[PDB]
Request: fold
Amino acid sequence: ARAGKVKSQTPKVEKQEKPKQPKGRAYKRLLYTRRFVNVTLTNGKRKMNPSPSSQ
Amino acid sequence: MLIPKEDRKKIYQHLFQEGVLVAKKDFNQPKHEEIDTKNLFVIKALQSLTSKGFVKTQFSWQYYYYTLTEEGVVYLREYLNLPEHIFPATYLAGQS
Amino acid sequence: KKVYTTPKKIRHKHKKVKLAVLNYYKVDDEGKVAKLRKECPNCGPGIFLANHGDRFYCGKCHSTFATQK
Amino acid sequence: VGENGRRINELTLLIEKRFKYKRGTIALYAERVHDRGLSAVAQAESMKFKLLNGLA
RNA sequence: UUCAAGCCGAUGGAAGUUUGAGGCAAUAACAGGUCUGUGAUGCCCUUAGACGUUCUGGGCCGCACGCGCGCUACACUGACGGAGCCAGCGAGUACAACCUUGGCCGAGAGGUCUGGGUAAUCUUGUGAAACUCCGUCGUGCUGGGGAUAGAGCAUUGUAAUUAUUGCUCUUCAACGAGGAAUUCCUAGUAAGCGCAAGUCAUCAGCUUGCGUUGAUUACGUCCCUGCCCUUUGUACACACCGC
RNA sequence: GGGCACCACCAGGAGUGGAGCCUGCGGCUUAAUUUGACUCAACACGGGGAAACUCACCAGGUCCAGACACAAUAAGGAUUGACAGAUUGAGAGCUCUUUCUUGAUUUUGUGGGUGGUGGUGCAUGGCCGUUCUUAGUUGGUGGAGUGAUUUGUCUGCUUAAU
RNA sequence: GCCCAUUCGGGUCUUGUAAUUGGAAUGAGUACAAUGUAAAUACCUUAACGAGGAACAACUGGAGGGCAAGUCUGGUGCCAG
Ligand SMILES: [Mg+2]
Ligand SMILES: [Mg+2]
Ligand SMILES: [Mg+2]
Ligand SMILES: [Mg+2]
Ligand SMILES: [Mg+2]
Ligand SMILES: [Mg+2]
Ligand SMILES: [Mg+2]
Ligand SMILES: [Mg+2]
Ligand SMILES: [Mg+2]
Ligand SMILES: [Mg+2]
Ligand SMILES: [Mg+2]
Ligand SMILES: [Mg+2]
Ligand SMILES: [Mg+2]
Ligand SMILES: [Mg+2]
Ligand SMILES: [Mg+2]
Ligand SMILES: [Mg+2]
Ligand SMILES: [Mg+2]
Ligand SMILES: [Mg+2]
Ligand SMILES: [Mg+2]
Ligand SMILES: [Zn+2]
Reply:
């Protein structure tokens, strides 16, 4: 089309029934854990949202 | 693919005896070395085998090379009848 | 490239007109058998002649008769 | 090597088939390379492997 | 020659041009070529009456005509006959059919029998040509020149007409050294001359090499052409096919 | 301004360009006269001297070489074969005449591959050509700049050559 | 973290993950009451019921840089954005 062709063309994938990421302070706690407590692995450098290791 | 089944059987037997197979990449060739069948037919058979696992194929220098995996060997045995403690080239015959 | 020519007439491989339990051979008594047409002279019995208007052949030797029967 | 004569044996057989030889007249041996880094082909192969794997 | 780098000349020396000739040959690139060397390959196309394959007959070779490598000649430093008669690179078959001497047949091409060679051994001294000698034509589109032509004889292959090539006779065209232009070249080079393998069943005017004959003129310069740097100027940076 | 080079010119040679003929490439022609490449760095180049093959083009025919997955027939045949002449360019079963063989290979679909001298070298690899076989290129200190950078790598004279 | 690291491993001590499960609250809701109040509401106070992923459920914007955070997967292919 020549008026929002792309929105109509895509396949609608459905929201997966995943568990709630808890609200308020819980989230903050989780974030903290992710950051400073657990300490993510680094070959040389830190990274917040890593990739599946590939090109 | 259109094989007189006897020929196919013979080919299989030969393969079993070997533990290996070397073919040309030469279609139109009337009869293969060793086996008394068309080379093309043999090649086709090998291809088929590869498609259902079994054989490992290399196409280098107008010469197809073929070796049997354990599963392939088992399949061959089944096709034949021969039970256990048999030829291929998975182990030596005696001392060589 | 250049466009394809398009006369029209296509020819396919014939499906063969398969037929089994064919009306050749017979039995009248029950115990013994009564062969229809004839068997091959060149090859052994079991193979049967093709019957036409003074023309015969057989398929195991692709097609190799001449004499009538 | 494989597991005490297998892959090597197969290779030998293949060779024989190719070049009309008899069993005994071909003898394969699989040896180590004295310093891999000095070799070039090996290095290239390694690089290729790495690429295949998916590395920076 | 600031008596440096070097260069120039004699002497000796096989060699005094980087001793000659090449082989390799940096950084950065080019939208240069090759996806028709490639089971090197992305993606697209196609994908069982294929744009796959495979047979059969053609076609790449057609001709008002342009340019580009080339060969053959415009003869007397020749042509034609005899006679003399000397190279170097090579290459060459047993599962095929290679080079093929030597003997007989044939004007030739080419046939045949026989060998020798898997090769410093045999082909092969590849007694190659251009050359050299004595004779025949003498400066006439002539015996220069050999094209187009017709016929037959050969060979290769399954197949030779759209002459494959060779040979035999016959036909004798254009062209008396080529305007504007422009290529190549500095020594065993240039040019001539043939051989040689490559492709190849058969075809050399091609090609990579080879040797034979063997000069003229510089041994300089930036006039042209290109390229290189330096200094300059720049509204350019996809960079003058620019903006 | 200063260099260098017979792919520049001088001093000369041999030439080509003219002639005929070979062969490339255009243009036209042609069913089709397959394609790649056009200043040097396209044009006796593709090792490209094509008789078929090669071959990609055309006119025509043949063949599956449709791997594998999954169902429709599953022997009351899946499909394989097939002398005889018409058929056919044609001792191509190419088929329509035929009524014998062939035995679960197949084959009819649906996933899925495979091949392509099909395309795009301005999507790539490798190789090659060309700038250039010219004399060019770089970085470590140290100095000049805030800096991009620069100097080294240069007036001169030498050399084939930073 | 480690008593010891002939190989283990107990795990004696401490942390995170499982539609396990279990005990202990909770007020957001409702609701006698009493409070408030001019009268009411609502607040504060209480009895009683009311949580287990199906709820007694947090949205908004962004995820190349500026600028915190995806060279994830498909759909698109100068389009629509
Ligand atoms: Mg066609
Ligand atoms: Mg030298
Ligand atoms: Mg000799
Ligand atoms: Mg004359
Ligand atoms: Mg040639
Ligand atoms: Mg040049
Ligand atoms: Mg040609
Ligand atoms: Mg040339
Ligand atoms: Mg030819
Ligand atoms: Mg191909
Ligand atoms: Mg391709
Ligand atoms: Mg390119
Ligand atoms: Mg290009
Ligand atoms: Mg510095
Ligand atoms: Mg500098
Ligand atoms: Mg969101
Ligand atoms: Mg967004
Ligand atoms: Mg997003
Ligand atoms: Mg960021
Ligand atoms: Zn018969």
